[PDB]
Structure formats: structure tokens, C-alpha cells
Design a protein around this ligand. Structure first.
Ligand SMILES: *P(=O)(O)OC[C@H]1O[C@@H](N2CCC(=O)NC2=O)[C@H](O)[C@@H]1O
Ligand SMILES: *P(=O)(O)OC[C@H]1O[C@@H](N2CCC(=O)NC2=O)[C@H](O)[C@@H]1O
Ligand SMILES: [Zn+2]
Ligand SMILES: [Zn+2]
Lengths: 344, 344
């Protein structure tokens, strides 16, 4: 193999998983006309409705929980209402009925911890809870979407460590795109798309970030956010509950290392959105889904410092995604960072 | 016809132009844990490289221009380099060579004006310049993308009134999606997609914002940003240079009214990204493009006030777009706003 060189002022790269192209402008500079107060988080606040013992907006009191805690969102985007007909059927005005369940999942009872500061056993409890909620809601819904939205820069105003889980009657757009691409690849090549992608990136080396006995982390060839990563198991695994105890402990360990590297990059608590994608569940869960491979995406906004971010606007809203930093530059910088968390 | 009622806690709506679905959660509330210095802009600053008479980063001096001014971006995402082979051809590592031209276009020589504060003749000069650059760059490139990125909230640090123009050797992803959908609709129905959409929204009324002799503005059925609009001509028109003098004056007038309504909504200078989509140009410009209809999109982030915005993150990055405010609520509020600009 040969490295992918930065020998042009612009080229385009393909995302085969979601079927889109990215414009890459290597070595492009910036000369902005003008440039672009963190109060300490108490360990317990009785007025924070994610804390043990606190009152929520529906009037219920949280228990004195030990590790994770799951509850129904009091302001939910989806609710388990009775089936009903589709409210509109004209070619240009198409609408369908929908239903679902939205949960909040606290990671830990203390508000002043984040995942990279938690111990490996504390993170294993999070992994076990992710598997449990996927089993439970997947019995009734074809798509269960676990996601974490971390930091004020992502619009998250409550600093307590947590994620959300939205299960839906419909397969969302991105899940449909990943179903189509993975199915077509397996029919043509006889192997799952992301198993072959893992094999090739291990041989090419230059986009790897971390490797462990059971997992790897890399910056995808087609990444759109500056320090975006992809996390996936080395074994062929369709859904999160299939992970063995050893695979779950190793996932907790490699997540701790990745998220500590992310905090060390600009010596700040690193914001992002992330989530998990696995084979659809629901009434067709027993069908053939061998084309699927479980994986997680991380989409972080920071670009050059704790204050200098990427804005996905303008040409990226009217035409297609664009980046300056190459994926090979990003991965090189991430590999070099220590796994010991910085201290002020 | 009958209004589209807000009678459920959730449903999904289809975008037939870009082929995607949106989750709509009518009447959903928010209870955030915590909540979410504008210096005066001088009319002329010799150190602002968009002003008449100022020195730019390449050392050249801007002329004393009268209305619009066009120049090559000194930090360009695309450059007109010599054709070259594609740097990679494996199924999972696909890349193609690319080339193009990036311009900056100042709207006016004074830095302390924005479009809604400009006169109708001043805005007509902008329309004429948009037509001219589309003709000129479309002779060599199949896609010319005009876009305006307005406001610090969109990452624009230079407050001088301006847009950008990026012409590319490739057809970008969104243009390919709109080519596919418009072509399929015309083959099946015998009329252009957006001409039929205009006809139906004029009959249904409830998503209209402004109507004039030659144009209309509406909130699309499938809109994703809170006060998103679509602007298009009433006549079937494939590309911007085809607009007649009367159509160009009327475009200047209706843009002034829309952007003044937008500023009046939260009594602030309203941020957004916008741009124009028309039939592809370049070497195939003479082929049959009757399925196309010229149009512009506006994508603004503000939701409830000058400080409270929508974040397209989390579930929207991992699954699909989601909104609380309905398109019918948004359009109703926009219709009621005065066309006289507010004053502090
Ligand atoms: P993260 O910030 O991603 O999610 C926290 C969620 O908690 C919901 N809340 C807040 C307050 C309350 O009393 N009940 C509740 O469910 C909030 O809407 C966020 O989605
Ligand atoms: P808007 O803020 O959308 O675009 C302004 C563009 O101007 C470019 N500049 C800035 C300074 C300079 O000396 N030359 C130049 O081309 C800047 O990169 C923005 O894209
Ligand atoms: Zn995925
Ligand atoms: Zn369009």
C-alpha cells in the first residue's frame, strides 16, 4: 500500500456507508476579520432534576441510585400513542403517523464527573445499561437510537453525565441509508462492508487512532468534522447486547483512552455528539442482518483550540461538506496525545 | 382543500426535492437547566479588506467601487488547476480530482448597511451581478453556487455586506439529489416538480409568507430550520440570467420585504445561510433541463428570541431532522409582521 498524499489544492472523497461526497482543501489557511466563564459544577444540587433525590418536572422524585438511572423524558419528542392512519397522502404532501419512547439515562450519580474521569468499572456499568435498554425497547420498535450530546457548545445546558435513547416506529433516514449500502456491499462482495473497511485500515495504518484486543478507533477516510472518529469491534457483531463480558470491559477501557485523548487535544472538556448504530430490531429482528456491523460515530466541533470551532454552514448547507484539515493529519495528531488526563 | 392539523404528538413529513424525512413534534415544551456586546460597525475602515480602497492579503488594493465588487478569494477552497488523474480507485477508498473558482462579491461599498436597509435599486444591482457571474463562470463549470452566510452566529466575522460564489468541476451532492428528484417527477407527471408545488401552496394558503406579481415566498411543508423559507418565481425559469428586467426589480422588492420581516421577528439583525439553485451549466448547458425550476433557500438558526437558537445536533446527526414549531405556525407568525423596519 501507499499513503494518500496531500498533493493537490482540492479533491473529493466518497463515503460508501451513507453515500455522499466531501470536498477536501488541503493546506488552506484562514485570516478572519475578528476572532471567535465556566462555573464549577457542584457534585449534588437538589434543584438539578438529574440528581439522586431530586424532583423532576412531572413531580416524581428520583431514587438514591448507585450507578446508572433510566427515566421517561418529561418533554418527549416521541410518545407511545395508539396507532392511527397517515394524515396526508398526496405526492408533494406526504406524511405518516409515528410513535415511540424517549428515555434519559444518567451515567453516574455525581454531577461533577465526565466519562474520561470515570473508572473502567464505572464505564462498564454504562455499557451494560446500553445493552439492557437496546434489548428492552428493541422488542417493540425497529430502531433504538442511543446518543450523547455533550457540552454547552452542543446546546446541552445540564452538565450532569448522561445520554438519551429514542426508539421509533420508523427507520430514520440515516439508518435507511446504512441499511441500503451495507446490503448492497454484502450481495456483491460476500463480506460485510465495515469488516472489510477495518481490515484495510489496519493494513494502511495512517488513519488509526487506537487499537485494542477487541476494538479499534480511526478517523474515517470520508470524515466531515475535524477530529471525527469511528469506533467498532474487531469481531463481526450485529447489535450491542451480543458483546461478551471481555468485549464490554475492553470497550470501557478504549472509550476511556479515546475520550482522554480528546480532552488532552486542546486541554478542555471536549464537546461532541455521538451515538451507536446496529442492526434493526422490532418485529423483523429475526430476519437476516448479516450485512450489518455494529459501530459508533463521534462528531466534535472544535478545530484549532478550545474556542475555535468548525461551522457546518454556507456551502455545506447548499452543496456538500467541505474540510481543510486532512483525515491523515487529524489521526496523526490524535495518536501522539498522552493517555494520562491533563491537570490544570 | 383542508388545513394540515396539529392533532398528534409526533408524525413524519417527506421532502420530495432532496428525498428525506423530518420528525415533527407539535406542542413540545422545553425546560433547560441553564440559559443560552455588539460594537458599532464603521462605514469605512482601511484595515477591512472588503472596503473600497483597502489592501487585501495578496497585496492588491481594492478600487473605489460604486455598487458591487467581485474578486478572487485569497484563501480559496477551489482553484483552477490543471486537470489531473483521480488519486485513488478502490471500492472503499474512492477519490476524484477537482478544480474550480471561488469569488467574494461585496453588495455595496458601505460596511454599515445590510440588504433589508438597502434601497430597491441598490438590491437590483446585486441581482444583476448574480446573473452576470452565473453567465461567466457557467461557461466553464457545470455548477455555480451563490451563497450568503450572514452573522457572527453563522461564523461570519467580517460584517461588510457580501456573498460568495464557488464554481466547481463536479456536481455537488445536493445538486445531484435535486437533479434526480426533478427529473423523475417530470417524466412521471409532465410538469416541473416546483411549478406544481407552487400551484398547490397558492391553493392551500396556510404556508404562504409573501406573494407578488412575479414571485412567492413560503415555509416548505418539509422545512427543517424553524423559520426556513423557499423563494421562487411564478414563471417557469431554469436559471437566474433568464429573469427579465421586471422580474429582477420585483425580486429586489420581495427580498427587501422578506428580510425586513425576518429582522422584525426578534428585533435584531437576523442571521442565516442562503443560496440559489438553478439548472446545471458547463459543457452540457444546451441539453434538456426543462425539469428544473430556479429557487432559493434560507436556513436561519434563531428559534424563540435574539439569543435562543436551534442546534442541529444529537439525534439529528445520528438519525434524522426533528422540529417542534410547525411550518404552519412559523408561516402564520411571519405573515403578520410589518414591512416597515423596526427602529430602536
Ligand atoms: P441531556 O442534556 O442530553 O438530556 C437531558 C434531558 O432531561 C430532560 N429533562 C429535564 C428536566 C426534567 O425535569 N425532566 C426531563 O426529562 C430534558 O428535556 C433533556 O432532554
Ligand atoms: P464572508 O465573510 O462570507 O466572506 C469573506 C471572505 O473574504 C475572504 N478574504 C478575507 C481577507 C482577505 O484579505 N482576502 C479574502 O479573500 C475570506 O477568506 C472570506 O472567505
Ligand atoms: Zn452509522
Ligand atoms: Zn434547492
Amino acid at each position: 500500500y501507499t499513503p494518500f498524499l496531500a498533493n493537490d489544492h482540492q479533491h473529493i472523497r466518497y463515503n460508501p456507508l451513507q453515500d455522499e461526497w466531501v470536498l477536501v482543501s488541503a493546506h488552506r489557511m484562514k485570516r478572519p476579520w475578528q476572532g471567535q466563564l465556566l462555573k464549577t459544577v457542584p457534585r449534588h444540587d437538589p434543584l438539578n432534576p438529574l440528581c439522586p433525590g431530586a424532583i423532576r418536572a412531572n413531580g416524581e422524585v428520583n431514587p438514591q441510585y448507585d450507578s446508572t438511572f433510566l427515566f421517561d423524558n418529561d418533554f418527549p419528542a416521541l410518545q407511545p400513542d395508539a396507532p392511527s392512519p397517515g394524515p396526508s397522502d398526496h405526492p408533494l404532501f406526504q406524511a405518516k403517523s409515528a410513535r415511540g419512547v424517549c428515555k434519559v439515562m444518567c451515567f453516574h450519580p455525581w454531577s461533577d464527573v465526565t466519562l474520561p474521569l470515570m473508572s473502567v468499572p464505572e464505564i462498564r456499568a454504562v455499557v451494560d445499561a446500553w445493552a439492557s435498554v437496546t434489548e428492552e425497547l428493541g422488542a417493540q420498535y425497529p430502531w433504538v437510537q442511543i446518543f450523547e450530546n455533550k457540552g454547552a457548545m452542543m446546546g446541552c445546558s445540564n452538565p450532569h453525565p448522561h445520554c438519551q435513547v429514542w426508539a421509533s416506529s420508523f427507520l430514520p433516514d440515516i439508518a435507511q441509508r446504512e441499511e441500503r449500502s451495507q446490503q448492497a456491499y454484502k450481495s456483491q462482495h460476500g463480506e460485510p462492508l465495515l469488516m472489510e473497511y477495518s481490515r484495510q485500515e489496519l493494513l494502511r495504518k495512517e488513519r488509526l487512532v487506537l487499537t485494542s484486543e477487541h476494538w479499534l478507533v480511526l478517523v474515517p477516510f470520508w470524515a466531515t468534522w475535524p477530529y471525527q472518529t469511528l469506533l467498532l469491534p474487531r469481531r463481526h457483531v450485529r447489535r450491542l447486547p451480543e458483546l461478551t463480558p471481555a468485549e464490554r470491559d475492553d470497550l470501557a477501557s478504549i472509550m476511556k483512552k479515546l475520550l482522554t485523548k480528546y480532552d488532552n487535544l486542546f486541554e478542555t472538556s471536549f464537546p461532541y455528539s455521538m451515538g451507536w448504530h446496529g442492526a434493526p430490531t422490532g418485529s423483523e429482528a429475526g430476519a437476516n442482518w448479516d450485512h450489518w456491523q455494529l459501530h459508533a460515530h463521534y462528531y466534535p466541533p472544535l478545530l484549532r483550540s478550545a474556542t475555535v470551532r468548525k461551522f457546518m454552514v454556507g456551502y455545506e448547507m447548499l452543496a456538500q461538506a467541505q474540510r481543510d484539515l486532512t483525515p491523515e493529519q487529524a489521526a496523526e495528531r490524535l495518536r501522539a496525545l498522552p493517555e494520562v488526563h491533563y491537570h490544570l
